[PDB]
Ligand binder design. Structure first.
Ligand SMILES: [K+]
Ligand SMILES: [K+]
Ligand SMILES: [K+]
Ligand SMILES: [K+]
Lengths: 259, 259, 259, 259
């Protein structure tokens, strides 16, 4: 029944002090890995023996590699233990969180096996991006009751419909703006996909201001887009508020049910 | 009983499998026409024998014309069958979906009969814009768009009042901003219609930043406009969500009446 | 009882057809006055006998003066009739709407009596601004049930508290940003009142981008300001939604009470 | 029974008219100190005998110092009486209003004892910033601030979770934007902390426009970030309004219990 004990330690950390300490140390390692990934891109000053400043990941490549490999060893042993402790190993692997784990650790090994092609580009940057997946294990650690997550799932149909309507509106407004502004001087509306950027920025009430209309027709349709954007940004608030109230009351009723 | 069978197959595609196949085929062609319209404006890049990169709709004008006319023939045939199978031709034409189909289908024929004036300026832009309403045919492919349109129809007098109040506030704030900003050096507030743009951008909380006040009075009234825009973000939500909720409740009442 | 008849015609337009036609013609004159004020600032092209283009109000000064004086005569006779028809003339004058009327018409007469000092500045622009008050008579004409107005009055305490808290937050964040950014190169945070503009723009989620932080401390506190701005723009929506629902239900219950 | 009478006069200014006078006097001095802090940074304009316009706090450093020390002596005396009249000195000091008073009152004395190092850089900025918390003493002058602070205390774990989730999303989006934008020419995404600014600006729907993506991948992920920001505008509203409504209901329950 050893698998039962280790699985109970993993899936339920507060039951045993050993489970709690393992949970806390692996959370600490997750946090240090995230911070190391963020910090290795910060340029170090004083330009030691170089024309320009180097990032922390290049000036201290060995140190950051040691930190990354320590974090990856911890994550790998933890994942293998979870795999060997799962009552249904196939079902555990089919879980989304196991997918997050595997896609978080495998970038390191892929970078290892491509050491011969050290000058790799496009795939190297993509692997370094995929290292961001380690953050998603925080929600395994900050696994507090997902009342907001449950309410977001409660509005999944509304969000899907809102995204479809947003796609329709974006295409329509982008067509209109491109044809209203294709002819301006040094125009940034060089195509309908180019106006996708303006439309998505306007309908979310960002307004960066890099692409702004310069024609009277362009400004009229940009105003229509702005009002549609006000509606877009404003709709979800009462929906989420009502759903959150309902779910919180359901959870309190379940609490008084279990008591 | 053949024409009415065809008509009910049009209304209810899920009944007959052949009707469902025709439904999915026309939906796929709608999506293809929309994507072709969006893509034909993209610059091809490194145009062969041309310094400037031509749009893909100009590099391959023959291929894009053939694809467009294929989609247009499909739409015209489908509309003609919808006209023949419809019991009341006048009322069916009066149905808003029929108007959408008509306004999406003529632009191709208008471009056809206008081939003598192939050197036009402006009108071709309007026709190519009107080609975008092929998207609205997707209303026939979703219950969400149908209920959204019903809600928008419900919020007609109320959203009209909100648009009227927004127009009032826009004129007031544009007046005060033009008069505060007309004297500035190299000012963009050259008139009150010119300040309509700044006012509508500020209320919607875009803030592109192309027109910003540069005087103390202008900045004061811009702050007032910004706060009024914060209120604008909230003004139409009660009406929209109340009408939508009423429609939702009546729909669930009908659904339980079905049971 | 003539005063009774004329007062009933004024305060209740739909009772008599004469009252309705007078109401509609004075509304038409209000609209034409508003449009004339907006249009007289639009620059006329072709620069007739001038170095630069003239606005419609200067190229056609006589025509716009005739239009303005016709509108002012109509407004003046209407206001005098209302004054002579009011059962309590002092109480009628004490009404806010009579104040709006008097402040809408008197700018014209003040401009008349200052014809000797035709080169007046600062007060002339202020009078032309005060001509915007004619728009507020639309809400006398579009006097439809102010459910939104009643709900806004229902939240008057909440809005007052929100403005006080907004003033506190603006002063605090402006102090912090000015002291974080007083030393940057060519800094636009030249004073705490200068940073009032940045703070009010950031806390409303405009982000024009003319004043942006350039220091690490400035960016940190700008991020705190941005989050506070998200809260500011987001709070009023559920409040107004609930109040609107409550007031609409109260009004429907009053309707079924009167029936 | 004199000390406790003084203490209850401090707690309940409306009881004794002399207590109310002292209350309004200290509130007026708080407002005066706040306005003096704000105004002393304004450039005086056309400095006599100086090319650069000095701030009013430097043109009249003696007058502003005298006004500041008057306000500080009033605050120090008022705090000393609050300390003497308080029954439990330790607990009263532990009360948050006492901490606010202390942190607002020391900066003047810290500047006093530091007069030897009158040539400091940076520390004086921190002290002058800490002078802004004289505003928070207005919490003693409003029930709205008190209930707002109680609500913020209630939304402690939940708003902590929201800040944690915002940090997670900010790190993820900053990573993807830095890696999409690091290769651009003259890019402002020089690191992941550098892209923290763009990410937090985009989620809050500011869009200053100083940092904008200039690559197709960057624009795609910026659009995703913009939509996530639209969701951010709605995420904390349910918690805030639910806790505030619970506090409001309990307050009305207590008020009717008073009746
Ligand atoms: K901007
Ligand atoms: K916004
Ligand atoms: K914005
Ligand atoms: K903006």
């Amino acid at each position: 029944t050893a698998r039962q004990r280790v699985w109970r330690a993993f899936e339920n950390p507060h039951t045993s002090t050993m489970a709690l300490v393992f949970y806390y140390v692996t959370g600490f390692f997750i946090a240090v890995s995230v911070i190391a990934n963020v910090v290795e891109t910060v340029p170090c000053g004083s330009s030691p023996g170089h024309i320009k400043e180097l990032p922390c990941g290049e000036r201290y490549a060995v140190a950051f590699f040691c930190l990354d490999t320590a974090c990856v060893m911890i994550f790998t042993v933890e994942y293998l233990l979870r795999l060997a402790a799962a009552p249904s190993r196939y079902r555990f692997v089919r879980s989304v969180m196991s997918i997050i784990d595997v896609v978080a650790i495998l970038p390191y090994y892929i970078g290892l096996v491509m050491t011969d092609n050290e000058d790799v580009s496009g795939a190297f940057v993509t692997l370094r991006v995929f290292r961001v997946f380690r953050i998603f294990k925080f929600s395994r650690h900050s696994q507090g009751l997902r009342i907001l997550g449950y309410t977001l799932k409660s509005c999944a149909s509304e969000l899907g419909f809102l995204l479809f309507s947003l796609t329709m509106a974006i295409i329509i407004f982008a067509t209109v703006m491109f044809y209203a502004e294709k002819g301006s001087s040094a125009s940034k509306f060089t195509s309908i996909p180019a106006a996708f950027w303006y439309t998505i920025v306007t309908m979310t009430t960002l307004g960066y201001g890099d692409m702004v209309p310069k024609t009277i027709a362009g400004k009229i349709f940009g105003s229509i887009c702005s009002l549609s954007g006000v509606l877009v940004i404003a709709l979800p608030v009462p929906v989420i508020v009502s759903n959150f109230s309902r779910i919180y009351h359901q959870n309190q009723r379940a609490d008084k049910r279990r008591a």
